[PDB]
Amino acid sequence: MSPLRRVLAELNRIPSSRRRAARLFEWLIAPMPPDHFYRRLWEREAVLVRRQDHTYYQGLFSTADLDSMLRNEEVQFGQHLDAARYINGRRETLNPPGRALPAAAWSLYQAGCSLRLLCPQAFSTTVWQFLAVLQEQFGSMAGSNVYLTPPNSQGFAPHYDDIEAFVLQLEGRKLWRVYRPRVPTEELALTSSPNFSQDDLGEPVLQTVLEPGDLLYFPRGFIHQAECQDGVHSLHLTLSTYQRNTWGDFLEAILPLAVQAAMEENVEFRRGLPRDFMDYMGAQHSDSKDPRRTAFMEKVRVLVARLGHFAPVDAVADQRAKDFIHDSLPPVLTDRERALSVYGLPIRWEGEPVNVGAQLTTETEVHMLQDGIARLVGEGGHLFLYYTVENSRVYHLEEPKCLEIYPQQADAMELLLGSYPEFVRVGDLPCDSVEDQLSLATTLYDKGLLLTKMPLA
Amino acid sequence: MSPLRRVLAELNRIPSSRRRAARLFEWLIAPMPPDHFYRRLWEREAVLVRRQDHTYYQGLFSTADLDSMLRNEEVQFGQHLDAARYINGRRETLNPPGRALPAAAWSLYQAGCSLRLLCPQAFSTTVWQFLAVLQEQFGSMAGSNVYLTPPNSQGFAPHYDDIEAFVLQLEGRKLWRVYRPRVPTEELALTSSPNFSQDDLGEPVLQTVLEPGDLLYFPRGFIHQAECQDGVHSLHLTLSTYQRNTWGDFLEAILPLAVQAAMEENVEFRRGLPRDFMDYMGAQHSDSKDPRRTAFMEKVRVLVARLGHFAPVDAVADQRAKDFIHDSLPPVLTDRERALSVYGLPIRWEAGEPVNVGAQLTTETEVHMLQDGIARLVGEGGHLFLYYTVENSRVYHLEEPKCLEIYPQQADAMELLLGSYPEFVRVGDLPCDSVEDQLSLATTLYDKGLLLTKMPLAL
Amino acid sequence: MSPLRRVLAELNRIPSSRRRAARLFEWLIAPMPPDHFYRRLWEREAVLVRRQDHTYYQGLFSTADLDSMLRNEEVQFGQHLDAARYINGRRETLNPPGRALPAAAWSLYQAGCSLRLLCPQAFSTTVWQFLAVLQEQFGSMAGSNVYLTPPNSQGFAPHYDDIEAFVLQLEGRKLWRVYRPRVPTEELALTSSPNFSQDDLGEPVLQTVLEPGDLLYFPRGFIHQAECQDGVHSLHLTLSTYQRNTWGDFLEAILPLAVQAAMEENVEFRRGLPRDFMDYMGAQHSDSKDPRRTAFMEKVRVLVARLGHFAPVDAVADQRAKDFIHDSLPPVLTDRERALSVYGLPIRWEGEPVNVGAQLTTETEVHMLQDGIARLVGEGGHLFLYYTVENSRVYHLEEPKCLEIYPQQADAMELLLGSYPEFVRVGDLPCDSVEDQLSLATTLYDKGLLLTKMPLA
Amino acid sequence: MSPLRRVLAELNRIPSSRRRAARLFEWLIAPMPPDHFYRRLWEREAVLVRRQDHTYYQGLFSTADLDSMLRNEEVQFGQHLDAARYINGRRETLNPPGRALPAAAWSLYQAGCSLRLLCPQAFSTTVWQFLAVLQEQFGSMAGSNVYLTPPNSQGFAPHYDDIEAFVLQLEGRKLWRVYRPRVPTEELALTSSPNFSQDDLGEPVLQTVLEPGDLLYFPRGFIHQAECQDGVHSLHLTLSTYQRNTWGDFLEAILPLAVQAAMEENVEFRRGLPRDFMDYMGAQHSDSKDPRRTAFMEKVRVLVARLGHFAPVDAVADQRAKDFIHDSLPPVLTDRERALSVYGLPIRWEAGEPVNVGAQLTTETEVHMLQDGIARLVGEGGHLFLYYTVENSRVYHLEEPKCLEIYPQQADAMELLLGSYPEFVRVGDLPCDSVEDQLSLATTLYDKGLLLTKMPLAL
Amino acid sequence: GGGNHQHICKP
Amino acid sequence: GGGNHQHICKP
Amino acid sequence: NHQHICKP
Amino acid sequence: NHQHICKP
Numbered sequence A, C: 001m002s003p004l005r006r007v008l009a010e011l012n013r014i015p016s017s018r019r020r021a022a023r024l025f026e027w028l029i030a031p032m033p034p035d036h037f038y039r040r041l042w043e044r045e046a047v048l049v050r051r052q053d054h055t056y057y058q059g060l061f062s063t064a065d066l067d068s069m070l071r072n073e074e075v076q077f078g079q080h081l082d083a084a085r086y087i088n089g090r091r092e093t094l095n096p097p098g099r100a101l102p103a104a105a106w107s108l109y110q111a112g113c114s115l116r117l118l119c120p121q122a123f124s125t126t127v128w129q130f131l132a133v134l135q136e137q138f139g140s141m142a143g144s145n146v147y148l149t150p151p152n153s154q155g156f157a158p159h160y161d162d163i164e165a166f167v168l169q170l171e172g173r174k175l176w177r178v179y180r181p182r183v184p185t186e187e188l189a190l191t192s193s194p195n196f197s198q199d200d201l202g203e204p205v206l207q208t209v210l211e212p213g214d215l216l217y218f219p220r221g222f223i224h225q226a227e228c229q230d231g232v233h234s235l236h237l238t239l240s241t242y243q244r245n246t247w248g249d250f251l252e253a254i255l256p257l258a259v260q261a262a263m264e265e266n267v268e269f270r271r272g273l274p275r276d277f278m279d280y281m282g283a284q285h286s287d288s289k290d291p292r293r294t295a296f297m298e299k300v301r302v303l304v305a306r307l308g309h310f311a312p313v314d315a316v317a318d319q320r321a322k323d324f325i326h327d328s329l330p331p332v333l334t335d336r337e338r339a340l341s342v343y344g345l346p347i348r349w350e351g352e353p354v355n356v357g358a359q360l361t362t363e364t365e366v367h368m369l370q371d372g373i374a375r376l377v378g379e380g381g382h383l384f385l386y387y388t389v390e391n392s393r394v395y396h397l398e399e400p401k402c403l404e405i406y407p408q409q410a411d412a413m414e415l416l417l418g419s420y421p422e423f424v425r426v427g428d429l430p431c432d433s434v435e436d437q438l439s440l441a442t443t444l445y446d447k448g449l450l451l452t453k454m455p456l457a
Numbered sequence B, D: 001m002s003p004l005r006r007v008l009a010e011l012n013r014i015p016s017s018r019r020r021a022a023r024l025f026e027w028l029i030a031p032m033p034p035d036h037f038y039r040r041l042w043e044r045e046a047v048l049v050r051r052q053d054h055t056y057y058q059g060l061f062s063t064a065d066l067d068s069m070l071r072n073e074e075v076q077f078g079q080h081l082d083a084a085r086y087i088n089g090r091r092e093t094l095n096p097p098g099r100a101l102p103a104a105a106w107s108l109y110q111a112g113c114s115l116r117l118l119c120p121q122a123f124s125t126t127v128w129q130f131l132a133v134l135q136e137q138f139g140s141m142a143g144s145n146v147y148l149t150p151p152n153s154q155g156f157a158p159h160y161d162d163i164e165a166f167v168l169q170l171e172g173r174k175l176w177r178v179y180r181p182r183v184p185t186e187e188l189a190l191t192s193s194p195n196f197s198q199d200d201l202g203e204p205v206l207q208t209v210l211e212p213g214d215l216l217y218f219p220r221g222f223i224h225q226a227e228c229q230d231g232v233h234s235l236h237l238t239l240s241t242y243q244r245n246t247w248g249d250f251l252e253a254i255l256p257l258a259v260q261a262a263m264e265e266n267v268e269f270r271r272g273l274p275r276d277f278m279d280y281m282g283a284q285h286s287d288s289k290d291p292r293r294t295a296f297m298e299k300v301r302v303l304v305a306r307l308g309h310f311a312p313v314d315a316v317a318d319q320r321a322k323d324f325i326h327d328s329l330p331p332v333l334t335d336r337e338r339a340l341s342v343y344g345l346p347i348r349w350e351a352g353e354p355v356n357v358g359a360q361l362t363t364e365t366e367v368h369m370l371q372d373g374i375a376r377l378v379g380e381g382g383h384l385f386l387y388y389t390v391e392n393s394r395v396y397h398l399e400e401p402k403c404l405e406i407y408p409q410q411a412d413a414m415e416l417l418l419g420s421y422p423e424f425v426r427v428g429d430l431p432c433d434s435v436e437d438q439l440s441l442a443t444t445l446y447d448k449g450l451l452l453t454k455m456p457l458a459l
Numbered sequence E, F: 001g002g003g004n005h006q007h008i009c010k011p
Numbered sequence G, H: 001n002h003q004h005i006c007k008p
């Protein structure tokens, strides 16, 4: 049994989804300790993990799967598959309009083009599970792409990306060159870069031949390029994450709401500007020595500084959570979670509906299906429980799913989220009455957001 | 000659437009010094200036002017005129649909309704010049509303507005009641308030009967209400200004640009958020004893503070200025400025052909901006634009941002003219690259009505 | 007193606005009889009327008025004034951005450019009255433009227009050349034409030197060009009308509503098309001899023909009327109509409001202010009275003004419209009660849509 | 082997797609002849075909298939599944928000609710091929809904639909009641009707218990309703077609183009309207004895009639065809068509490289459209486009109009292939200008999956 | 009062 | 319950 | 040329 | 290049 099939079988035996995500990431970067990686490597340095086990990823994704994907699934050019080649220091994309048929796709490949599948998780359920579990421990959307390059060619021009990348070598061998940020403004870049020429690059901080089973990580801002040598092709899956999840983005949300709270709660932000500040403020007077100008600048900085007091941090913290619940991929349930949830109710069609009518009781012991499926957020004057269970494997195919949580149950809905994975007896919920304890539990269970210790009858 | 007519005659004799605005404000609050007012009264206290001269505002606006207006103008109900009454502590607005004909308007008035003429500066040229000049020294759009209340009635319910108000009593008399901000959040409020009941009010910080000529000023947030008592009506013009012109409104623009710049210029803002911050941050955790939480709040405050270094102050200043040029009312020229500008060129049609054609600017021409509050140079994406107000309608935003691009070869000169006001500059002395660059600018400005020559041109 | 000032003084003494419009048109084309013109000339031939009275139009519009317009009014380039010149067989437009100041306008003029004022009726009240009265007898919007050309020059390239044109020579002399439609498709053109070269033109059907006081009429489709000779300029006002007021446009409205009524009232329009009509219909088979194709064509024509039965003619007739009420310019009232309407109520400010409180009585004799101010139209399940009284002198500055007419008054509102200019005693209206007779009368009067025989007290 | 499985096996053995569609329809209404049906029954009468073979539809769709679907697919309530019940003569639809999980769906079913699976062709490949083939001989989009009703209940209130319906009984039995159009306007109605009460109904023109295998057909406008009575449920698939495919709908497109053309080609339509027609035309004059009125009506009728000569029939035909290619479901290929098309090229990944690469079309290649209802050549503004259905989703309009431009140098050839079906054409014999024009077309079509070679390519 | 046969499948 | 001072004049 | 519409 | 978004 390959290390992957084995680690997956190992994950199916782990109760907590949080412990399941941790363990999976632990497996992805092994032997390297996750605490060391996140402390010294993450967002800091480029890292290569020499696995020395060409079967490490066996079962994840292969070229045969991609080939089977072009034949069965409705793989679309541009929308899903991309074909590109790098020649004479120029990036060219050969993308015919329409569906990507095996005959056309392999034609481009044989022609020296590289193929990139944009949404592997939408086709491969294995990749979905991988990303779906790894995202819970990233606290951010775990995207992914698949690159297939033919022998002796380069599909992409040097460049950097706007996400933290984890390259997994699946088949073949490939020569990689990773560079550290060229200038200060490129370190942890906000946006992806254009395609670079060899003249723009300095010396590689890392240059290696990734072998199947190896992992290569590098931060956003780190330029990189790879190429296939004589005799063999290459196939890798690049796991990405942390796109626009910086402190700056958090601020972007905080600030507008901050200046608003302040203007409402503090008169100093409601005081009128100078009747003649235009006489000394502006590019035109950027060189003026008018003392009033320095007073203005001083007043601005002082006021800006005072915003940290009015910043609705927990609010924006929830909004980002809501957006993440929205960005997340649907959860992959373990056999146990399935059997103990609505998804595993023995209610089927045998004739007539058999085993129909399972009822939750004040005795039933329950707890959230997983830890990263739901998030409680308060918008307007109401409270809503956002969840991922009904999310598509296609980024934003569906829209923000939620259900209104009434105050009489808020305390109980908050408890359930916090006490995971501890089984809570429904009858002992922090609500006003039994009708409020059963409704919530029933409403959640039927949604497939909750599970019971023992299968319902 | 009424004080208004005299002061206006005076403004025409004053060369600087900045000085006219100041002088006119001086006249408005006289005998009170503008200096004292802006330093102690403005946005702080309610003020009453018992003029003791019922002719002070003669020539400004009269009830007769209103009657003539509803008759000779297309005064639209709801759009230009509001008829309303206050009774039983309830505010009612009975605005007939359509044009406000004298017959209908006076019928409502007779019925006990107050008439409020929303944009008097659109129908009255005298009121226009008044505001057009006052806006310059206010450094903010100056607007106004005229209120005509019949005897023994109240048109509006007590409330407060979102602007600085200068109530001018034009005819009759009225009993006013002004209150200080009821609570902290109401002090210098951001938006107008709803209609209030007498129960929501405390004691008046000022209660008086305004007589023609008097001026009653009060800051946004100050509740107020008026009414007629004896068998006499009331007519006043409320000049308003400083709407959304606060420090908070300036920060609204700054922040996004700041945070953006901070992210592009400082890696600390580009660092990723904690992987598990949602575990201790959020409404359901406003009480957590998790240290990582306090560290989070601290990091936010530290980053917020650091924004002061990335704030594009000059940029937002110019944008607000640009928006001001846009909100501004067209400039009211002095006979002097006119005769010396393109507007006063003697070229007109006579007999069967244009007469006195050929006015040409020369390098020997001494010039300077037609006025100090008509133009503003602003940069935008490597492009430099000169926004002006000379083509604005007397109707707020009835027109759109008018400008003309300024090429780098003129930037220095254009920047000069804007600061040299009102000092005459020989065109041949403008800091450009070529003589064709000085004449092109000067010509392009003169013809646009943004410049004025020291002597009329006859070449 | 000039013929115009005299005809205007004559119009102010004519009760019916319909008789007032007729008379004015009679004056515009005199000595030519209006019945002859509309019968043999209108839309058929180009006509020149040699007035032999250079004072005929004195008072209408002059260059001094235009000059006074650039100085006082806010005349805008492009929006209002247009400056163009015709040289080397090419039409060039010199339109600087911004306001048209006398200095700039006369500069272009002296340069050899021609000036065209697009909305003379918005500035000149005389032109407004003219157009406002002439439209009532055209049954269509009476637009207008003013052209001023300097000596020895041509402002416009040859072309035709999409409207019936009446050129009025105001000052100077100008050489005109009018051509008859070049080809069948140009006769009574739908849209204005591009600018033509001299090679596109045939021989002029008319070539004359229009003298002040003369009138030159020519149909849409008739190409034309004018030019000023040696020594003098030219100034004319071109009165236009009948834009998109053809039988085709009436159909455009009728047809959609026709096929709809038919499909609802006749099953033959609800019968399914052939299951295989695509095998023999279409450009591809435009050459096929399949008999079914001829059957299809036959079925189409037969069905189309049957639409005349379901055509909601009166409905579209009203919609066009509503649109015309909307397009119309505000009415110009005669002293009498003014004195006998709300606009002449002696209610003013003398102190206090004096003479306030005029009341209509069941004895009051009333009748529509004019004939072309209001139109009754039924939309939805309701009836509305559309009127022009509140219209701006600027095409569509305001929007469709109307007031809901309740059924209990419909019969009375229909009567008032039909009995004009007959004075109807309010007490003898076809309504259900006195409350219904006074309300309507009062509602109309106050709107300035009605007048009384004797001024109210 | 069930009749369905056999007939399907038969369709695969038939070369022409036009013949498959026909043959499949023959199978649907058997023993009744398609000829007789379309000539006497279609859009005229309600029809019942007592099959007397409960296995007739075996393989099409089953309740088990539905159970597996709600479990393995993302069946959304309201979007894919509708649960409803009819009681007290009131129609109620209790659609829980969100995904339809087996537990919830079966709970509603147990409660007396009928389940209606809106787009079965999206989740079932068997149903897809069924409709994908039937649409070809219908010359109109063929859709369907599956209905599952529990014992002793009625899911829907009596009503009529806007499409031609073919009810197929799959499991259990149900009591049906079909009525003829209540009034003239309801005959072949344009839009679906509201929910009706038994009071609005007359006597049934047909009332019967449908048994698995039976087919009940009825035209739009025919009211109907069904219910289960004994302790047995019911499952049927209602195939529908001919929505908005009437003569009136064809005229809707024609007229505007007609009147337009008529105005551009005939001066009679460009003549101006009467100056005073509003004097005798209008609702307030529907009675006027004015002769000019009768002349008006006559002129309208005369002009309306004259439009028949300006009608762009071929244009509207192609547009409707284009819209049909768009509404169509993707074609279901026969093993033959596949193996001989681009879809059946043996080129796939093996070992470490693509195997069997290099299939090249030649001038000696005999070809012809992959099928007869997959493409349609349409002109638009000097541009010629070939619209196809091969890339359409099984979800109606989930994709947009797919096409590829055809240059004039190919128009004749492309027009040939469309009519030559299913006759093989040597590529070197296509009517083009150059050999590069025949290969470019043939190649561009083959690779797109719109063509099929007589023999598999191995060059 | 919900609707009936949904032909177009949009839904 | 109508509004109050209308500063911007749009109206 | 001759624009029948007062103002665009 | 590497598009983090599944499908645009």
Ligand SMILES: O=C(O)CNC(=O)C(=O)O
Pocket (backbone or CB within 6 Å): A114, A147, A149, A154, A155, A156, A161, A165, A167, A224, A225, A226, A227, A238, H001, H002
């Ligand atoms: O494989 C290549 O040629 C380029 N790959 C990448 O940029 C990547 O995996 O992020």
Ligand SMILES: O=C(O)CNC(=O)C(=O)O
Pocket (backbone or CB within 6 Å): B147, B149, B154, B155, B156, B161, B165, B167, B224, B225, B226, B227, B238, F004, F005
């Ligand atoms: O005159 C009144 O009754 C109320 N007036 C005002 O609120 C004002 O002038 O700002």
Ligand SMILES: O=C(O)CNC(=O)C(=O)O
Pocket (backbone or CB within 6 Å): C114, C147, C149, C154, C155, C156, C161, C165, C167, C224, C225, C226, C227, C238, G001, G002
């Ligand atoms: O006067 C000109 O040069 C052109 N005039 C016109 O086209 C006109 O009056 O309709």
Ligand SMILES: O=C(O)CNC(=O)C(=O)O
Pocket (backbone or CB within 6 Å): D147, D149, D154, D155, D156, D161, D165, D167, D224, D225, D226, D227, D238, E004, E005
């Ligand atoms: O099955 C039912 O109760 C109703 N069925 C239909 O209306 C149908 O199949 O078109």
Ligand SMILES: [Mn+2]
Pocket (backbone or CB within 6 Å): D159, D160, D161, E004, E005
């Ligand atoms: Mn039905």
Ligand SMILES: [Mn+2]
Pocket (backbone or CB within 6 Å): B159, B160, B161, F004, F005
């Ligand atoms: Mn106020």
Ligand SMILES: [Mn+2]
Pocket (backbone or CB within 6 Å): C159, C160, C161, G001, G002
């Ligand atoms: Mn013309």
Ligand SMILES: [Mn+2]
Pocket (backbone or CB within 6 Å): A159, A160, A161, H001, H002
């Ligand atoms: Mn990359």
